[PDB]
């Protein structure tokens, strides 16, 4: 159905339901603690955001994030169980991803196999296609968002990652006189969703290589690499990676969003199927 | 700066001004002619009913007022006063007796090359002012360019003292994951005003928009291709310099589209 938005008056009201545990992350987003349902003994993750620390700006952001998490339902988009709201704090009860962020796993593993990247990108492709079909653009897809809920080494000694997309604070839902409108305005309005595709292309590069596709010593020097967008292969690791994977890479990071592949086209690509 | 005077009711502002005929009406509210009883000066007052519009539409007018307060330019509309009753908001602005430029163009048909140069020169100065102060209009069109006075010169050519209005849509403008079109949008957000100048100049010379179609999708395809057709009979009398600046103001890529400061320095305006 729909997510309950329970309005309570202090932390003890929500502590009647859940046992609060250790802290899993902290930043400008608030803090995320482990929690255990006293009734069902199920493990959850509770994101506490202090409404009084962050002004009306970050609170209006948090309200759209909650509104988007309420309406989405997908196997690889984080599940919002309930929302509790005191006058001071706001609590987001979500499914627990015990294995942490994908960025931490990549840094400890080095890089991933082509099949392991294939599975992760397929999950990303399905979730991003779901969001785009519902007029939702993530706008901030990166390895620090992709949570991992469970792991599985199969018989091929290849790891299967059950990933979960999080952080919808920057997300937006899609919707002047036309004779006066400029081409880049038409492109930005008609291709407002293609930034998620670029992010999928970037994360696929980092899973295969272990380094970002563009890196520099200054911000601008980095921006210039992005505009050129020259995907550099010839590296020592690419020949054992199929040509079919490099074609979909080139399709995911077309500099022009006009010919950048779409989410639905991605799902139909032979590299994710066969 | 402009004081934001909070008053009680409509009779209170009618103590200051004598209200006259209505000059415009729409979703933006209504614009009346008004005369200061004390000073005898005529102004244009935009009355906005804070419930007839709405909260989404009231915040628009709040940013327009904040932008009109900080700008000062001989071809940007002057905001004299802002009065606020609990039910309405009043913007006292300098009166442009001659109305909108779109109405003048439709009645006249098209303009001479010198008449267009005077209009575009004023536009170029005003848009260069805004860009130099990091402000983008984003909605420049013939329906915005107000005309305060007209003057026929010795050559039987009209001199238009224009005023830019409607700033409601104006803006005061992890990296490794960022997409190219976002960098392009963040770096070239101001060039749309330049494209609007090119459109306005084409319509003043030609009398028709540079891109027109029977459907929106066909219209967008024309715009993204950006093909400038100078084949009509009135282009034969238009100098090559005017067509060159037209092609520069309507470069499809905003990266290669001429800037406001470069426009002011172009040979056609000098
Ligand atoms: C600012 N963004 C980058 C962060 C990314 C995650 N963010 C969350 O809000 C969030 C929402 C729902 C969640 N379900 N399970 C989560 C977890 C976890 C975890 C497990 C082991 C070790 C570390 C973490 C961890 C990592 C980063 C941040 C918090 C915890 C989880 C996290 C915002
Ligand atoms: C919705 N945009 C397209 C319209 C464009 C003008 N807009 C104004 O708000 C505004 C602000 C300050 C102003 N000073 N003098 C003005 C005038 C006038 C006038 C004179 C004769 C005949 C008609 C008009 C006229 C035309 C259109 C709208 C209102 C009045 C004036 C107008 C919004």
Numbering used by the authors:
A (entry chain B): 99 to 273, 285 to 383
B (entry chain A): 100 to 272, 286 to 382
Publication passage describing the model:
There is a lack of available structures for STK33, which makes determining the molecular basis for our high-affinity STK33 inhibitors difficult. The STK33/CDD-2211 cocrystal contains one dimer per asymmetric unit, with each monomer showing clear density for bound CDD-2211. All residues in the construct are ordered except for a segment of the activation loop (residues 273 to 283 in chain A and 274 to 284 in chain B). As seen in other kinases with the exchanged activation segment conformation, the STK33 KD dimer is formed by the activation loop segment and the following two-turn helix with the APE motif from one monomer docking onto a surface formed between αE and αG helices of the other monomer. The biphenyl (BB3) binds to the outer lip of the active site near the hinge. It interacts with L122 and G123 on top and G198, E199, and M245 at the bottom through van der Waals interactions. The indazole (BB2) binds the ribose pocket and forms hydrogen bonds with backbones of E193 and C195 at the hinge region. The pyrrolidine with dimethyl amine (BB1) contacts the Mg2+ positioning loop, glycine-rich loop, and activation loop. The dimethyl amine forms a hydrogen bond with D265 that normally interacts with Mg2+. BB1 is shielded by F127 at the Gly-rich loop (top) and E242 and N243 at the catalytic loop (bottom), and it interacts with these residues through van der Waals interactions.
